[PDB]
């Protein structure tokens, strides 16, 4: 059926990229198909199954974005407001002039990609935010940042008078039915925690770091992710306020060349050539600052677009594509950090093989 298009491509991908295991989820209007390939851990050879848990890296940011969007829908968070309104420990800093919307679109004034070594806890972090000097015109330039979305995670928790992880579980994960989604994987499920493989073939797992939960910390199953995707595609039964929150994550906020930056989500209009997608998910977009044009009346969720997000850790590589107009989406989790190029090619072949493009 569906699985005839998918199995040869995945096989080819895993062989070409030396991927121990993958878990894939295809979301269609007539149902969601889950598929498991290879081993959860190369050394032991344990198969990937329904319960297998994957690091999703920066894919976590879609969750963070969603919870931010819900606090907005509940009228507890204004995206246009200075971030210091909700984190008064940052009054007087650059964040009097930087908004939650900026942070959610990586247009917060040049905020760097990584958390500095100097920063080792909340106090030292807030301190650093207070000290930091913007290096790019706020709301005009895009630099992919963990400090940025990490801070939006903090701002959101503050505006909801709760702690991040429990709030996330209560307001987003539980209602979406995401019962296998963990920030800290419990001892009981450690057997189901896949082992990573880095690009030198060594086994890796993610270490704790500051802002990990907010920026890259989730471990989960392809099915659970498929619930988030199902909701974006209007294929799930979900609270009205939550469904508004999710939809707003897909609002166009900035034009960045061929890419439109939604709230975390990144999208390309259709039809789209793989090269556009390789470039948009490549070096010039991820690791350089890019001019960004504010879409002033925001722009509603589009039905003629390729929406995606990549995510990685040293040992895992995830990718999510959504076609809102075709009510189709794809989740590809792997326990190997393989190139974004390969992710884009695989996702593309798969989706045209099913005539969603």
Author numbering: 8 to 364
Reported in the publication:
The solvent content in the WT-HaBLA crystal was 44.6%. The tertiary structure of WT-HaBLA contains 12 α-helices and 16 β-strands, which is the same as in halophilic class C BLAs. In addition, the binding sites for Mg2+ in the structure of WT-HaBLA were not identified because of the noisy electron-density map owing to the low resolution of the X-ray diffraction (2.9 Å). From a structural comparison of these five catalytic residues in WT-HaBLA and EaBLA, only a small side-chain rearrangement of the catalytic residues in WT-HaBLA was found. The r.m.s.d. for side-chain atoms between the active sites of WT-HaBLA and EaBLA was <1.4 Å. The active site was positively charged owing to the existence of Lys68, His113, Arg149 and Lys316 even in the negatively charged circumstances of the overall structure. The side chains of Leu120 and Ile293 of HaBLA form van der Waals contacts (within 4 Å distance) with the aromatic ring of Tyr151 in the active site, as observed in EaBLA.
To evaluate metal-ion affinity and to identify protein metal-binding sites for Sr2+ and Cs+, a class C β-lactamase (BLA) derived from the moderate halophile Chromohalobacter sp. HaBLA, although a moderately halophilic periplasmic protein, has a particularly abundant content of acidic amino acids similar to those in extremely halophilic proteins. 560 (HaBLA) was determined to resolutions of between 1.8 and 2.9 Å in space group P31 using X-ray crystallography. Seven binding sites (site 1 to site 7) for divalent metal ions (Ca2+ and/or Sr2+) and one binding site (site 8) for Cs+ per HaBLA molecule were identified by X-ray diffraction studies including anomalous dispersion.
